[PDB]
Amino acid sequence: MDNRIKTVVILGGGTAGWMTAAYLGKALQNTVKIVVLEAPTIPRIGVGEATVPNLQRAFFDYLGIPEEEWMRECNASYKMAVKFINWRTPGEGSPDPRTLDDGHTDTFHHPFGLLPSADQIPLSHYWAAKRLQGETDENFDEACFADTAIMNAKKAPRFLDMRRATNYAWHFDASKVAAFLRNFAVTKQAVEHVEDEMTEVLTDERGFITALRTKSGRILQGDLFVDCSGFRGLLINKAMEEPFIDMSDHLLCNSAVATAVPHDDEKNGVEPYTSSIAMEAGWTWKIPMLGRFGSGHVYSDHFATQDEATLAFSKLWGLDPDNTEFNHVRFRVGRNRRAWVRNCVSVGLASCFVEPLESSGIYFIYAAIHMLAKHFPDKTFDKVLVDRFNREIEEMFDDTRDFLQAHYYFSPRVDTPFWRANKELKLADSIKDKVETYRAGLPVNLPVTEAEFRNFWTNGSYYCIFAGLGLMPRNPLPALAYKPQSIAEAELLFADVKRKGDTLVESLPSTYDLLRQLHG
Amino acid sequence: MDNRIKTVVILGGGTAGWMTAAYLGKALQNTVKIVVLEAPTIPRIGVGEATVPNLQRAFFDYLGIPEEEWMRECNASYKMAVKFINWRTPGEGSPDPRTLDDGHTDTFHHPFGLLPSADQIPLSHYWAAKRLQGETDENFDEACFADTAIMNAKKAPRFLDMRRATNYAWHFDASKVAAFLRNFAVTKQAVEHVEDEMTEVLTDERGFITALRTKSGRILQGDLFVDCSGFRGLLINKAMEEPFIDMSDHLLCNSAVATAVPHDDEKNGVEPYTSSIAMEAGWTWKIPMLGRFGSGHVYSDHFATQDEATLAFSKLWGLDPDNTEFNHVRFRVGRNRRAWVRNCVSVGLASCFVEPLESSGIYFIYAAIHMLAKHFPDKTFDKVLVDRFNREIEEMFDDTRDFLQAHYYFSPRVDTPFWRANKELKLADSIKDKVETYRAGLPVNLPVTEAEFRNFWTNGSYYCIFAGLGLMPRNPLPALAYKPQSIAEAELLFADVKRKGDTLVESLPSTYDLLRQLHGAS
Ligand SMILES: Cc1cc2c(cc1C)N(C[C@H](O)[C@H](O)[C@H](O)COP(=O)(O)OP(=O)(O)OC[C@H]1O[C@@H](n3cnc4c(N)ncnc43)[C@H](O)[C@@H]1O)c1[nH]c(=O)[nH]c(=O)c1N2
Ligand SMILES: Cc1cc2c(cc1C)N(C[C@H](O)[C@H](O)[C@H](O)COP(=O)(O)OP(=O)(O)OC[C@H]1O[C@@H](n3cnc4c(N)ncnc43)[C@H](O)[C@@H]1O)c1[nH]c(=O)[nH]c(=O)c1N2
C-alpha cells in the first residue's frame, strides 16, 4: 500500500519558498511532486541580508552546491562578525564610534571564532578573571579573538590560494539567492513553478487543506502544504486559524526602513562584517558587498514614527529624505502557537521571527526545513511527528529570542525612552537562569566541538554580548584560584591570539582584493 | 582575606574516596590539602565490576595514567557489550540460552560501537524499516554491529600490536583499582591518609561541617567535605539530614548475592563481554577476567528471600552453597534530594544508586567528580555553584534511571511475580516520551560525534534494548519511503558490517591470547 505524500504545494516564492523547494527536492529524491505557487504581484521582502556559518554546511552542501558557485551568483561577501557601535554610550545615530571614558571607541565585536581552551576552561574565563582582579584592562574581543585584529584591518578570512584563515558567515542580496534557488529548483529538482495569486484555500471537514485556488482558475491539489506566504501567514494563520503569539514584551522593535547605499571599494575597502549601529529608537544594519552596502534602521514604532526613523536613517549615510528608494516593512515578533498544524507546515516569516540583530531569519528557514525532512510524514500525519517538529521550532526560537533580549536588557544606555523601556521588560526564565550561571562566573552553553539548533548560541557568543555591553561576572570562576598551571597556560593562548592576529594581517589579502578575484 | 578552600576532607577510602582524592590532587594543582579519613575494615572477595568506554578519557587520562598501566594492576579485561541471556523466555536461570519460538537463541547484545548513517539517518532505522516490511529476518545486533560477530567468536577488541579494532570498556577487581589509586595519591600527590573511624561530625551554627572527630581523638578540620562513606551517607544523610528519595517504584531490584568463580581460560577462552543472565526474581552478572569471573545475582527481596536467591545463584553455576564464599548486600535505589548541601558533597554510594545492569556505579563517581571540579567553590559556597552541580547530578541520574526502566517494562516474560510486577511500574515522563518517539519510528537521543552526562544513552543503545526485548516501532521512519537512494546506500553499509565481521573474526587474536600478552601471563 502506498500511503505516501504524493504532492507538496509550497505557497510563496521568496527565500523561504525556494529554499523549501530546493531542499525538499533534494531530500525526497523525485518521489514527490513539488509545486511552488508564487504571485509576482505580491512583492517579496528582499532587503540585503547576512547569515551565520552553518548556512554552507546545513543547506548549500546538502544541495551539492559549492560555496564559490552560489557566492559568485548573488554578489556574496564575507562576514566574520557583527560589530556593535555606540551601544554603550548616549546620542544620535552615527557610523563613527563615540569615545568611552577609557578613550576606547564604543565598539565591541561578536565573531564566530571559537574560543581556545586550557584545562577544559575557555579563554573567556581566564580573561574575565584577570579583569575582575585588576590585572588587565584589555577588552574581550581584542584579547580572545585574532579575528578582531583581522576585522579592524578589514582583511579577508581566506588567502588568495583560498586557504581558510578564520571562521566566517555570508552577506548577500536576498533576491539573488532567491533567484539562484528558483533556477536550481526548476532546472535541477524539477519543481513546478506556477506564477499566480492564491484566492481561496480549500479544506475538508476535518480541517485539512486539499488545494489552493488561483485567480487564473487553476486548482492546485496536494497532500502537504508549506506556508511560505510571509508575515500574512495565509495558510497557518488565516485558513488554519492558528494564533500567532505576540512577543513585543520581549523585544520592542517591530519596523524597519532600508535601502542599498553605493560604495567606493577602491578608497575604503570592504568591511568583512555586519555592523549594527545603535540609534535613539533602535539600531541600523550595514551589510557590505562589492560596490554597494545594504543598510536599514530597525526601530520600534512605539518610540518613533516612520518619518523620524527615515530621517535619522538618512542622516546616517547622508541620503536625500524625499527622493530615496526606501523599503518600509512592519514585522511580527514571535512564533505561532504551533508551527505545523494538520497538513500545513509554516516556514519563514509565516512561522516565527525576531528582529534581524543576529541574522536569525535565513537560519530559521533552513533549520525548519531540515526539521521537516527529518519528521516528514505520510498521509496519516502522525501526531508525534507533528509535535516533535513543533517542539523543535519552539526551542530553536526561544533560544534565539533570549539571546537577542540579552542585547537590550543589559545595555547601559538610558538617554531615550526606547532604551529606558528595554529595562522594564521581563526576561524569559531560561535567559535569567543563564545570566545567573554567567554571574557566578560559570560557562554558559559550552560548545560540543542536528542538536546545534536547540542550543545554537555558545559560551563564546554570550561573552561577546555580556562583556561587550559591560555585564561582567560577580567574581572569577572559583576553580581558577586553585589552578596556577592553567593560568600560565592561558597566558600562552593570549600570546598565541596576538602572534596569530599580527601574522595574518601582514600575510592576508584585503577583503576587497579577495572579492575581486572571486567576482568580476 | 583569602577566600579559597585550604583543606578538603574525604570520608571513605573505597573506590569513590580514592578516585576523588586522586582527581582532586591533579585538579587543584597542590594548592589545597587533601585528607582521606577511612576505616581499615577487612579484605573481601572481588566479585568484579564492569565499566563504560569513557572511564579512560574522563578519568585515567586526566591523571596521566596509561590504560595498560592501570589494567596491569587490577587483572582487567575487555568489555565490548552487555549480553542479555534469557530475558525473553521463561523458567529458571541457565547460563545457556533458551531457544525462541522463531528458532534463534535468546541472546541480544548491547555493544559500544556507534552506528553508521546514510543520509543523516542511523543504520538502525534502515534495519527497522526492512524488518517491519518483511525484507529481513535478521536481528538488530547482528544487522548493525560487526562487534556482534567478534563477540560471538570471543575475539579481542585490539590486535596483538595493540591497534584498536572496536570500541570497548573494561572489567576489573575495583578493590585493586582503589588500592592502585590509593598508592598514586599517597606517593605522587602527598595525600594525608588517616586510618581511623569517624565518630562525630562537628557542625557550626549555620549547619556547615567544621570537622570530623575520629575514634583515636583527632579532630580533622576542613573547609569542604566529600562524603564517600558508602550507603550510610554519614555526612549527607545523617549529619546534614538530607533525605534520600527512594525510587523502588521505578526499579524493583534491591539486593545482591555475589562470588568469584575460578575459570578454565585455556579451555573455554575469555568472553570479551559482560553477560546478564535473567533469573526468576532478578538477573545474574558474569564479569570475566583472566583466571576467574565475578558473578552476582541481583534480585528484589520482596520477591525472593536471601536464602532463596543465594540457592538459585549457586544452582546457576553448579556451586556448593555451603562451600562458597558469598558477599551479600541490600542496596538503596534512588538519589539524595540534593547531592551537595552546604559544604558537604556526596559522591559514590553515599550519593545516588541504581542496580548495576548497565555499569553506572563507577561512571557516577568520575562524573560527579568531574562536575565537582567544574563547580569547585571557595568558602563563600555560592548557592549557584552548588545548585548547578545538583542539577547535573539529577539529570545524569534520570538519564540512566530512564534507560534502566526500558530494560524491564518491555520484557515479555510474565512467568513469575517479579517479571509481571515490572510491568505495573510507573514510567517516568521522560522515558515515556522516549518510547513514544521511538514508537513513531524517530531517532532517540541521536549521538553528537562534558555534556555526555546529560545524554549518555544514545539511539543505538535504546535500539539494542528495545529491539532486543521485542519492542519495535509501530511503523518505519516515514521519511524512508521517499528515499530509494539512501535505502540503497544503507544496503552497502549493511554489507560493510558483514565483511568487517568476516575480516576481524579471522584477523583478531582471542581475548584470551591478548590478555596473556598484556598481563605478561605468557
Ligand atoms: C527588516 C528585515 C530584515 C531582515 C529580515 C527580515 C526583515 C523584516 N530577514 C528575514 C528574511 O528576509 C526572510 O527570512 C526571507 O528573506 C523572506 O521571507 P519569506 O520568504 O518567508 O516571505 P516573503 O514575504 O519574503 O515572501 C512571501 C511570498 O509569498 C507570496 N504570497 C503572499 N501572498 C500570496 C498569495 N495570496 N498568492 C500567492 N503568493 C503569495 C509572495 O508573493 C512571496 O513569494 C533576515 N534574515 C537574515 O538571515 N539576515 C538578515 O539580515 C535579515 N534581514
Ligand atoms: C551489588 C553491586 C554491584 C556493583 C556495584 C555496587 C553494588 C552494590 N558497583 C558500584 C561500585 O562497586 C561502588 O560504587 C564503588 O566500587 C564503591 O563505592 P563507595 O566508595 O561509594 O562505597 P564503599 O562502601 O565501598 O566505601 C565506603 C568507605 O567509607 C568508609 N567508612 C564508612 N564509615 C566510616 C566511618 N565512620 N569512619 C571512617 N570511614 C568510614 C568505609 O570504611 C569505606 O572505606 C558497580 N559499579 C560499576 O561501575 N560497575 C559494576 O559492575 C558494579 N557492580
PDB file of C-alpha atoms in Angstrom, chain A residues 10-140:
ATOM      1  CA  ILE A  10       4.524  25.443  -1.333  1.00  0.00           C
ATOM      2  CA  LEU A  11       2.718  28.812  -1.210  1.00  0.00           C
ATOM      3  CA  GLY A  12       5.343  31.511  -1.661  1.00  0.00           C
ATOM      4  CA  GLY A  13       8.272  32.340  -3.875  1.00  0.00           C
ATOM      5  CA  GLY A  14      10.534  34.317  -1.598  1.00  0.00           C
ATOM      6  CA  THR A  15      13.631  32.957   0.089  1.00  0.00           C
ATOM      7  CA  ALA A  16      11.559  30.644   2.316  1.00  0.00           C
ATOM      8  CA  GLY A  17       9.661  29.111  -0.580  1.00  0.00           C
ATOM      9  CA  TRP A  18      12.618  28.423  -2.856  1.00  0.00           C
ATOM     10  CA  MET A  19      14.866  27.206  -0.031  1.00  0.00           C
ATOM     11  CA  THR A  20      11.998  24.810   0.779  1.00  0.00           C
ATOM     12  CA  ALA A  21      11.679  23.676  -2.858  1.00  0.00           C
ATOM     13  CA  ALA A  22      15.397  23.315  -3.369  1.00  0.00           C
ATOM     14  CA  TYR A  23      15.899  21.352  -0.119  1.00  0.00           C
ATOM     15  CA  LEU A  24      12.810  19.040  -0.311  1.00  0.00           C
ATOM     16  CA  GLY A  25      13.673  18.496  -3.975  1.00  0.00           C
ATOM     17  CA  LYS A  26      16.986  17.025  -2.832  1.00  0.00           C
ATOM     18  CA  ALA A  27      15.514  15.270   0.185  1.00  0.00           C
ATOM     19  CA  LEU A  28      12.549  13.453  -1.457  1.00  0.00           C
ATOM     20  CA  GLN A  29      14.612  12.019  -4.391  1.00  0.00           C
ATOM     21  CA  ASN A  30      11.923  12.623  -7.143  1.00  0.00           C
ATOM     22  CA  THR A  31       9.279  10.606  -5.285  1.00  0.00           C
ATOM     23  CA  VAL A  32       7.012  13.614  -4.662  1.00  0.00           C
ATOM     24  CA  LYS A  33       5.571  16.292  -6.956  1.00  0.00           C
ATOM     25  CA  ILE A  34       6.629  19.739  -5.763  1.00  0.00           C
ATOM     26  CA  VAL A  35       4.672  22.829  -6.784  1.00  0.00           C
ATOM     27  CA  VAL A  36       5.656  26.401  -5.858  1.00  0.00           C
ATOM     28  CA  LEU A  37       2.713  28.843  -6.045  1.00  0.00           C
ATOM     29  CA  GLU A  38       4.034  32.436  -6.087  1.00  0.00           C
ATOM     30  CA  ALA A  39       2.403  35.781  -7.077  1.00  0.00           C
ATOM     31  CA  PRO A  40       4.756  38.172  -8.918  1.00  0.00           C
ATOM     32  CA  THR A  41       2.115  40.768  -7.954  1.00  0.00           C
ATOM     33  CA  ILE A  42       2.815  40.368  -4.180  1.00  0.00           C
ATOM     34  CA  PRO A  43       6.395  41.608  -3.543  1.00  0.00           C
ATOM     35  CA  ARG A  44       8.902  39.512  -1.571  1.00  0.00           C
ATOM     36  CA  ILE A  45      10.851  41.046   1.336  1.00  0.00           C
ATOM     37  CA  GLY A  46      14.438  41.003  -0.198  1.00  0.00           C
ATOM     38  CA  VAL A  47      16.459  43.769   1.645  1.00  0.00           C
ATOM     39  CA  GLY A  48      20.222  42.773   1.538  1.00  0.00           C
ATOM     40  CA  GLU A  49      20.958  40.078   4.078  1.00  0.00           C
ATOM     41  CA  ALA A  50      23.542  38.425   6.395  1.00  0.00           C
ATOM     42  CA  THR A  51      23.801  34.826   7.644  1.00  0.00           C
ATOM     43  CA  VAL A  52      25.532  32.512  10.107  1.00  0.00           C
ATOM     44  CA  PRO A  53      28.316  29.989   9.398  1.00  0.00           C
ATOM     45  CA  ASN A  54      26.221  26.791   9.277  1.00  0.00           C
ATOM     46  CA  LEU A  55      24.466  28.021   6.094  1.00  0.00           C
ATOM     47  CA  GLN A  56      27.009  26.411   3.748  1.00  0.00           C
ATOM     48  CA  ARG A  57      27.079  23.055   5.668  1.00  0.00           C
ATOM     49  CA  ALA A  58      23.373  22.643   6.693  1.00  0.00           C
ATOM     50  CA  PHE A  59      21.985  23.879   3.286  1.00  0.00           C
ATOM     51  CA  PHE A  60      24.108  24.530   0.216  1.00  0.00           C
ATOM     52  CA  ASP A  61      26.315  21.441   0.859  1.00  0.00           C
ATOM     53  CA  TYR A  62      23.118  19.359   1.112  1.00  0.00           C
ATOM     54  CA  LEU A  63      22.134  20.599  -2.362  1.00  0.00           C
ATOM     55  CA  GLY A  64      25.582  19.683  -3.745  1.00  0.00           C
ATOM     56  CA  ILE A  65      26.213  23.394  -4.406  1.00  0.00           C
ATOM     57  CA  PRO A  66      29.803  24.591  -3.684  1.00  0.00           C
ATOM     58  CA  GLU A  67      30.287  27.922  -1.879  1.00  0.00           C
ATOM     59  CA  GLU A  68      32.164  29.718  -4.622  1.00  0.00           C
ATOM     60  CA  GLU A  69      29.377  28.757  -7.095  1.00  0.00           C
ATOM     61  CA  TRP A  70      26.416  30.221  -5.228  1.00  0.00           C
ATOM     62  CA  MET A  71      28.539  33.026  -3.852  1.00  0.00           C
ATOM     63  CA  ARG A  72      29.585  34.157  -7.396  1.00  0.00           C
ATOM     64  CA  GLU A  73      25.923  34.368  -8.450  1.00  0.00           C
ATOM     65  CA  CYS A  74      24.448  36.644  -5.715  1.00  0.00           C
ATOM     66  CA  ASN A  75      27.305  39.129  -5.276  1.00  0.00           C
ATOM     67  CA  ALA A  76      28.210  37.395  -1.979  1.00  0.00           C
ATOM     68  CA  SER A  77      30.630  38.927   0.571  1.00  0.00           C
ATOM     69  CA  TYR A  78      32.368  37.586   3.671  1.00  0.00           C
ATOM     70  CA  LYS A  79      31.092  38.054   7.253  1.00  0.00           C
ATOM     71  CA  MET A  80      33.318  37.374  10.298  1.00  0.00           C
ATOM     72  CA  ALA A  81      31.152  39.026  12.994  1.00  0.00           C
ATOM     73  CA  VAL A  82      28.538  41.515  13.984  1.00  0.00           C
ATOM     74  CA  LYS A  83      30.333  44.709  15.162  1.00  0.00           C
ATOM     75  CA  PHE A  84      28.320  46.750  17.660  1.00  0.00           C
ATOM     76  CA  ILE A  85      28.810  50.557  17.505  1.00  0.00           C
ATOM     77  CA  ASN A  86      27.629  53.127  20.087  1.00  0.00           C
ATOM     78  CA  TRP A  87      25.522  50.618  22.080  1.00  0.00           C
ATOM     79  CA  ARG A  88      27.090  51.654  25.447  1.00  0.00           C
ATOM     80  CA  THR A  89      27.061  55.455  25.010  1.00  0.00           C
ATOM     81  CA  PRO A  90      24.349  58.104  24.554  1.00  0.00           C
ATOM     82  CA  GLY A  91      23.453  60.203  21.484  1.00  0.00           C
ATOM     83  CA  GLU A  92      22.013  60.367  17.981  1.00  0.00           C
ATOM     84  CA  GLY A  93      22.999  57.926  15.235  1.00  0.00           C
ATOM     85  CA  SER A  94      26.457  57.968  13.686  1.00  0.00           C
ATOM     86  CA  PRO A  95      28.599  55.419  11.701  1.00  0.00           C
ATOM     87  CA  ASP A  96      31.616  56.631  13.680  1.00  0.00           C
ATOM     88  CA  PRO A  97      32.064  55.390  17.211  1.00  0.00           C
ATOM     89  CA  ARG A  98      31.761  57.829  20.145  1.00  0.00           C
ATOM     90  CA  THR A  99      34.575  57.700  22.758  1.00  0.00           C
ATOM     91  CA  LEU A 100      34.357  55.892  26.126  1.00  0.00           C
ATOM     92  CA  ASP A 101      35.833  57.207  29.369  1.00  0.00           C
ATOM     93  CA  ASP A 102      38.960  54.958  28.946  1.00  0.00           C
ATOM     94  CA  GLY A 103      39.424  56.586  25.488  1.00  0.00           C
ATOM     95  CA  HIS A 104      38.497  53.410  23.548  1.00  0.00           C
ATOM     96  CA  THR A 105      35.854  53.870  20.796  1.00  0.00           C
ATOM     97  CA  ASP A 106      32.382  52.499  21.748  1.00  0.00           C
ATOM     98  CA  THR A 107      32.728  49.302  19.699  1.00  0.00           C
ATOM     99  CA  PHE A 108      32.676  45.561  20.551  1.00  0.00           C
ATOM    100  CA  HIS A 109      32.649  42.504  18.244  1.00  0.00           C
ATOM    101  CA  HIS A 110      30.670  39.218  18.030  1.00  0.00           C
ATOM    102  CA  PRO A 111      32.965  36.964  15.975  1.00  0.00           C
ATOM    103  CA  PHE A 112      32.264  33.334  15.073  1.00  0.00           C
ATOM    104  CA  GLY A 113      35.818  32.407  16.057  1.00  0.00           C
ATOM    105  CA  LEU A 114      35.778  29.519  18.525  1.00  0.00           C
ATOM    106  CA  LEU A 115      37.477  30.247  21.874  1.00  0.00           C
ATOM    107  CA  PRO A 116      40.528  28.171  22.670  1.00  0.00           C
ATOM    108  CA  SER A 117      40.521  26.288  25.996  1.00  0.00           C
ATOM    109  CA  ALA A 118      43.112  25.467  28.662  1.00  0.00           C
ATOM    110  CA  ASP A 119      42.427  22.777  31.297  1.00  0.00           C
ATOM    111  CA  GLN A 120      38.833  22.383  29.919  1.00  0.00           C
ATOM    112  CA  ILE A 121      38.147  26.083  30.563  1.00  0.00           C
ATOM    113  CA  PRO A 122      37.626  28.558  27.744  1.00  0.00           C
ATOM    114  CA  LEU A 123      39.798  31.608  27.291  1.00  0.00           C
ATOM    115  CA  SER A 124      36.899  33.952  28.147  1.00  0.00           C
ATOM    116  CA  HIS A 125      37.079  32.813  31.802  1.00  0.00           C
ATOM    117  CA  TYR A 126      40.841  33.439  32.098  1.00  0.00           C
ATOM    118  CA  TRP A 127      40.172  36.869  30.551  1.00  0.00           C
ATOM    119  CA  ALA A 128      37.282  37.590  32.992  1.00  0.00           C
ATOM    120  CA  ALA A 129      39.481  36.569  35.983  1.00  0.00           C
ATOM    121  CA  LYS A 130      42.304  38.986  35.128  1.00  0.00           C
ATOM    122  CA  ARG A 131      39.702  41.713  34.521  1.00  0.00           C
ATOM    123  CA  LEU A 132      37.896  41.306  37.864  1.00  0.00           C
ATOM    124  CA  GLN A 133      41.338  41.121  39.646  1.00  0.00           C
ATOM    125  CA  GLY A 134      42.589  44.328  38.084  1.00  0.00           C
ATOM    126  CA  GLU A 135      45.430  42.514  36.134  1.00  0.00           C
ATOM    127  CA  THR A 136      44.263  43.668  32.649  1.00  0.00           C
ATOM    128  CA  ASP A 137      42.044  46.427  31.156  1.00  0.00           C
ATOM    129  CA  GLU A 138      42.133  44.941  27.619  1.00  0.00           C
ATOM    130  CA  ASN A 139      38.723  44.170  26.008  1.00  0.00           C
ATOM    131  CA  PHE A 140      37.292  40.667  25.480  1.00  0.00           C
TER     132      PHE A 140
END
